[PDB]
Coordinates of C-alpha atoms and ligand atoms in Angstrom, one line a residue:
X1 CA 11.0 17.1 -21.2
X2 CA 10.4 17.0 -17.4
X3 CA 13.4 17.2 -15.0
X4 CA 12.7 13.7 -13.7
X5 CA 12.7 12.5 -17.3
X6 CA 16.1 14.0 -17.8
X7 CA 17.4 12.4 -14.6
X8 CA 15.7 9.1 -15.6
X9 CA 17.5 9.0 -19.0
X10 CA 20.8 9.9 -17.4
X11 CA 20.5 7.1 -14.8
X12 CA 19.5 4.7 -17.6
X13 CA 22.4 5.7 -19.8
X14 CA 25.0 5.3 -17.0
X15 CA 23.3 2.1 -15.7
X16 CA 23.4 3.4 -12.1
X17 CA 19.9 2.4 -10.8
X18 CA 21.6 -0.1 -8.4
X19 CA 23.9 2.6 -7.0
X20 CA 21.2 5.3 -6.8
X21 CA 19.0 2.8 -4.9
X22 CA 21.8 1.8 -2.5
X23 CA 22.4 5.5 -1.7
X24 CA 18.7 5.6 -0.6
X25 CA 19.2 2.5 1.6
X26 CA 22.4 4.1 3.1
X27 CA 20.8 7.4 3.9
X28 CA 17.4 6.0 5.1
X29 CA 16.3 6.8 8.6
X30 CA 16.9 4.3 11.4
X31 CA 14.6 4.4 14.4
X32 CA 14.0 1.9 17.2
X33 CA 11.4 -0.9 16.9
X34 CA 11.4 -2.0 20.5
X35 CA 7.7 -2.9 20.8
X36 CA 7.9 -5.0 17.6
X37 CA 10.9 -7.0 19.0
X38 CA 9.3 -7.8 22.4
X39 CA 9.2 -11.6 22.8
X40 CA 5.4 -11.5 23.2
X41 CA 5.1 -10.1 19.7
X42 CA 7.3 -12.6 17.9
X43 CA 4.3 -14.4 16.4
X44 CA 2.7 -11.1 15.3
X45 CA 5.5 -10.4 12.7
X46 CA 5.8 -12.1 9.4
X47 CA 9.4 -11.2 8.7
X48 CA 12.1 -10.7 11.4
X49 CA 13.8 -8.0 9.3
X50 CA 10.5 -6.0 8.7
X51 CA 9.3 -4.1 11.7
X52 CA 7.4 -0.8 12.3
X53 CA 9.3 2.0 14.1
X54 CA 7.9 2.6 17.5
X55 CA 7.3 6.3 16.8
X56 CA 5.0 5.7 13.8
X57 CA 3.4 2.3 14.6
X58 CA -0.4 1.9 14.7
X59 CA -1.6 0.9 18.2
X60 CA -4.6 -1.3 18.5
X61 CA -7.2 0.0 21.0
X62 CA -6.8 -3.1 23.1
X63 CA -5.7 -3.2 26.7
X64 CA -4.2 -6.8 26.3
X65 CA -1.6 -6.2 23.5
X66 CA -1.8 -3.2 21.3
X67 CA 0.8 -4.4 18.8
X68 CA 0.3 -4.8 15.0
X69 CA 3.0 -4.7 12.4
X70 CA 1.7 -1.5 10.8
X71 CA 3.0 2.0 10.3
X72 CA 1.3 5.4 9.7
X73 CA 3.0 7.1 6.8
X74 CA 2.0 10.7 7.4
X75 CA 3.0 12.9 4.4
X76 CA 2.8 16.4 5.8
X77 CA 3.4 18.5 2.6
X78 CA 1.3 16.2 0.4
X79 CA -1.4 16.1 3.1
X80 CA -2.1 12.4 2.6
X81 CA -1.7 9.6 5.1
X82 CA -1.4 5.8 4.5
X83 CA -1.2 2.9 6.8
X84 CA 1.3 0.3 5.5
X85 CA 1.1 -3.1 7.1
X86 CA 2.3 -6.7 6.4
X87 CA 0.0 -9.3 4.9
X88 CA -1.9 -10.5 8.0
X89 CA -1.0 -13.8 9.6
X90 CA -3.5 -16.5 10.5
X91 CA -3.4 -15.1 14.1
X92 CA -3.5 -11.4 13.2
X93 CA -6.5 -11.1 10.8
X94 CA -8.7 -10.0 13.8
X95 CA -6.1 -7.4 14.6
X96 CA -6.0 -6.3 11.0
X97 CA -9.7 -5.6 10.8
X98 CA -9.7 -4.1 14.3
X99 CA -7.1 -1.6 12.9
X100 CA -9.3 -0.9 9.8
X101 CA -12.2 -0.3 12.2
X102 CA -10.4 1.8 14.8
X103 CA -8.6 3.9 12.2
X104 CA -11.8 4.5 10.1
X105 CA -10.3 3.4 6.8
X106 CA -12.5 3.3 3.8
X107 CA -10.3 1.2 1.5
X108 CA -7.7 -1.6 1.7
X109 CA -5.2 -1.8 -1.1
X110 CA -3.7 -5.3 -1.5
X111 CA -0.8 -5.7 -4.0
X112 CA 0.1 -9.4 -3.6
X113 CA -1.5 -12.7 -3.9
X114 CA -2.2 -15.1 -1.0
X115 CA 0.2 -17.7 -2.6
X116 CA 3.3 -16.5 -4.4
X117 CA 6.4 -18.5 -5.5
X118 CA 4.9 -21.6 -3.8
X119 CA 4.6 -19.9 -0.4
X120 CA 1.8 -18.4 1.7
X121 CA 2.7 -14.6 1.6
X122 CA -0.6 -13.5 3.2
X123 CA -3.5 -15.1 5.2
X124 CA -6.9 -15.5 3.5
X125 CA -8.2 -12.5 5.6
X126 CA -11.4 -11.7 3.6
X127 CA -14.3 -14.0 2.6
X128 CA -14.3 -15.4 -0.9
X129 CA -18.0 -16.3 -1.0
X130 CA -21.0 -14.1 -0.1
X131 CA -22.6 -16.9 1.9
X132 CA -19.5 -17.7 4.0
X133 CA -18.9 -14.6 6.1
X134 CA -16.0 -14.4 8.6
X135 CA -16.2 -13.8 12.3
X136 CA -13.1 -12.7 14.1
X137 CA -13.8 -13.8 17.7
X138 CA -10.8 -12.1 19.4
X139 CA -11.7 -8.6 18.1
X140 CA -15.5 -9.2 17.8
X141 CA -15.9 -8.2 14.1
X142 CA -17.9 -9.7 11.3
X143 CA -16.9 -9.5 7.6
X144 CA -19.1 -10.3 4.6
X145 CA -18.3 -10.3 0.9
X146 CA -21.0 -8.1 -0.7
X147 CA -19.8 -8.2 -4.3
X148 CA -16.7 -8.3 -6.4
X149 CA -15.7 -7.1 -9.9
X150 CA -12.9 -9.2 -11.3
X151 CA -10.7 -7.7 -14.1
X152 CA -7.7 -9.1 -15.8
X153 CA -5.0 -7.8 -13.5
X154 CA -7.0 -6.5 -10.5
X155 CA -10.2 -7.1 -8.6
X156 CA -12.4 -4.7 -6.6
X157 CA -14.5 -6.1 -3.8
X158 CA -17.2 -4.5 -1.7
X159 CA -17.0 -5.8 1.9
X160 CA -19.2 -5.1 4.9
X161 CA -17.4 -4.8 8.2
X162 CA -19.6 -4.9 11.4
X163 CA -18.5 -4.2 14.9
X164 CA -20.5 -6.9 16.7
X165 CA -20.2 -5.0 19.9
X166 CA -22.2 -2.0 18.7
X167 CA -23.8 -3.5 15.5
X168 CA -22.5 -0.6 13.5
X169 CA -21.6 -1.6 9.9
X170 CA -19.3 0.0 7.4
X171 CA -18.6 -0.6 3.7
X172 CA -14.9 -1.3 3.0
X173 CA -13.6 -1.3 -0.5
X174 CA -10.9 -3.9 -1.3
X175 CA -8.6 -3.0 -4.2
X176 CA -6.6 -6.1 -5.1
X177 CA -3.9 -5.8 -7.7
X178 CA -3.4 -9.4 -8.8
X179 CA -0.7 -9.2 -11.4
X180 CA 2.3 -7.8 -9.4
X181 CA 5.1 -10.4 -8.7
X182 CA 6.7 -10.3 -5.2
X183 CA 10.0 -8.5 -5.5
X184 CA 8.8 -7.6 -9.0
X185 CA 7.1 -4.8 -10.9
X186 CA 3.7 -4.4 -12.5
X187 CA 3.5 -5.5 -16.1
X188 CA 3.2 -1.9 -17.3
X189 CA 3.1 1.6 -15.9
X190 CA -0.3 1.7 -17.6
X191 CA -1.9 -1.1 -15.7
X192 CA -0.4 0.2 -12.4
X193 CA -1.7 3.7 -13.1
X194 CA -5.1 2.4 -14.1
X195 CA -5.3 0.6 -10.8
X196 CA -4.1 3.6 -8.8
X197 CA -6.7 5.9 -10.3
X198 CA -9.4 3.4 -9.6
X199 CA -8.4 3.6 -5.9
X200 CA -8.3 7.4 -6.2
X201 CA -11.7 7.6 -8.0
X202 CA -13.4 5.5 -5.3
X203 CA -12.9 8.2 -2.7
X204 CA -11.0 5.9 -0.4
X205 CA -8.0 8.4 -0.2
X206 CA -10.3 11.3 0.8
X207 CA -9.2 13.1 4.1
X208 CA -12.8 12.7 5.2
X209 CA -11.9 9.0 5.8
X210 CA -9.2 7.4 7.9
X211 CA -6.0 6.5 6.1
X212 CA -6.2 3.9 3.4
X213 CA -4.6 0.6 4.4
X214 CA -1.9 -0.6 1.9
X215 CA -0.2 -4.0 2.2
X216 CA 1.8 -6.5 0.2
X217 CA 3.4 -9.5 1.9
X218 CA 5.8 -7.4 4.0
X219 CA 4.1 -4.0 3.6
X220 CA 7.3 -2.3 2.2
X221 CA 8.2 -3.4 -1.3
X222 CA 5.2 -3.2 -3.5
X223 CA 3.4 -1.1 -0.9
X224 CA 6.2 1.4 -0.9
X225 CA 6.2 1.6 -4.7
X226 CA 2.4 2.2 -4.7
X227 CA 2.5 4.9 -2.1
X228 CA 5.6 6.7 -3.5
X229 CA 3.9 7.0 -7.0
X230 CA 0.7 8.3 -5.5
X231 CA 2.3 10.9 -3.2
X232 CA 4.6 12.2 -6.0
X233 CA 1.6 12.5 -8.3
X234 CA -0.3 14.3 -5.5
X235 CA 2.5 16.7 -4.9
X236 CA 2.8 17.5 -8.6
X237 CA -1.0 18.0 -8.6
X238 CA -1.0 20.3 -5.6
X239 CA 1.5 22.6 -7.2
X240 CA 0.7 21.8 -10.9
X241 CA 4.4 21.7 -11.2
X242 CA 6.3 18.5 -12.2
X243 CA 9.6 20.1 -11.5
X244 CA 9.0 20.7 -7.8
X245 CA 8.8 16.9 -7.2
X246 CA 12.1 15.2 -6.1
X247 CA 11.1 11.5 -6.1
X248 CA 14.2 10.3 -4.1
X249 CA 13.6 12.9 -1.4
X250 CA 10.0 11.9 -1.2
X251 CA 11.0 8.3 -0.7
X252 CA 13.5 9.2 2.0
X253 CA 10.7 11.2 3.7
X254 CA 8.4 8.2 3.6
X255 CA 11.2 6.0 5.0
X256 CA 11.1 8.1 8.2
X257 CA 7.8 6.3 8.9
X258 CA 8.5 2.7 7.9
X259 CA 11.7 0.9 7.0
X260 CA 12.6 -0.5 3.6
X261 CA 10.0 1.1 1.4
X262 CA 10.7 -0.1 -2.2
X263 CA 12.8 -3.2 -2.0
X264 CA 14.6 -3.4 -5.4
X265 CA 16.3 -0.9 -7.7
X266 CA 13.9 -1.9 -10.5
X267 CA 11.0 -1.0 -8.3
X268 CA 12.5 2.5 -7.9
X269 CA 13.0 2.6 -11.6
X270 CA 9.4 1.6 -12.1
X271 CA 8.1 4.3 -9.8
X272 CA 9.9 6.9 -11.8
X273 CA 8.1 5.5 -14.9
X274 CA 4.7 5.6 -13.2
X275 CA 5.2 9.1 -12.0
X276 CA 6.5 10.4 -15.3
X277 CA 3.5 8.8 -17.2
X278 CA 0.9 9.7 -14.6
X279 CA 2.2 13.3 -14.9
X280 CA 0.5 13.5 -18.3
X281 CA -2.9 13.1 -16.6
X282 CA -2.1 15.4 -13.7
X283 CA -1.1 18.3 -16.0
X284 CA -4.3 18.3 -18.0
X285 CA -4.4 15.4 -20.6
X286 CA -7.2 13.2 -19.4
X287 CA -7.2 11.1 -22.6
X288 CA -4.1 9.2 -21.3
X289 CA -6.4 7.6 -18.6
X290 CA -8.3 6.1 -21.5
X291 CA -5.1 4.8 -23.1
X292 CA -4.1 3.2 -19.8
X293 CA -7.5 1.3 -19.6
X294 CA -7.0 0.1 -23.2
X295 CA -3.3 -0.8 -23.0
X296 CA -3.8 -2.6 -19.7
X297 CA -6.4 -5.0 -21.3
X298 CA -8.8 -4.9 -18.4
Ligands
LIG301 O1 5.5 -8.2 -0.7 C1 6.4 -7.3 -0.9 O2 6.3 -6.5 -2.0 C2 7.6 -7.2 0.0 O3 8.1 -6.1 0.3 N1 8.1 -8.4 0.4 C3 9.2 -8.6 1.2 S1 10.2 -7.6 1.9 C4 11.2 -8.6 2.7 C5 10.8 -9.9 2.5 C6 9.5 -9.9 1.5 C7 8.8 -11.2 1.1 O4 7.6 -11.1 0.6 O5 9.3 -12.4 1.1 C8 11.5 -11.1 3.1 C9 12.4 -10.7 4.2 N2 13.2 -9.5 3.9 C10 12.4 -8.4 3.6
LIG302 CL1 7.4 -9.5 25.9
LIG303 CL1 -5.0 -14.0 -3.7
LIG304 CL1 2.9 -20.3 -6.8
LIG305 CL1 -0.1 -16.4 6.2
LIG306 CL1 15.9 -1.4 2.2

């Protein structure tokens, strides 16, 4: 029916997802990451092969060291921005919340678990109990769990972030997709889309706020899948025209701002599936959102 559906079926028939995905890797932008590779920043990076480009990196408003492994993905035509970052390290959780503060983000999207495949993919950067708030002494921020709503494959938390210097406080929404394997895919397009539209419905993507912060362990694989689907749905929505959306071109545009977005060919295949199914809602069938909520078994 849609032009991306036709392409999807042709790629499936010819079994060429791996070759399509490798073409994207071959054509993807390459820009320098000199700040990331400075010896003083070695312990601020989780993975030595995952670095922010200098031209798009988020700078901390600190005179000491402004480096965080985070990139501003600025989608000009779609008119949506995202900050993609790695899962914070035990020594960078203060930097992480400093970035959320300085960038005026309303939401944090977390697509991984703290422990995956027997390893620590992300530091425990938010408080798990209301009565045990966290204080980040290096960046002078306080973080309190206000409430949380646990569902079968995601959790939403309300956090309070306080600048202890000025005593201003902000409510941060934490959207935690808990059933997405590292280097894997979500269990259905339905559950992925149900989650994405929860983030959308919260207002956290509004241009009145700073860019939403999106992370997985590296800030590229699952994070890239999430952002590609959202931007493609937004572009389709802006024009009310599925055919104007070239998913591979959009992914290449995003990769001008951070390397390695979408880490497997199956994640690329999955993001086609999410966009194709999300298109039903965009183009005026709001009952599919109800089917997602049911099929996902919240
Ligand atoms: O968390 C993700 O979805 C993601 O992109 N993970 C990535 S990308 C990436 C790695 C990982 C990892 O978690 O081990 C290891 C080193 N190579 C690149
Ligand atoms: Cl250095
Ligand atoms: Cl977790
Ligand atoms: Cl495990
Ligand atoms: Cl960690
Ligand atoms: Cl890659």
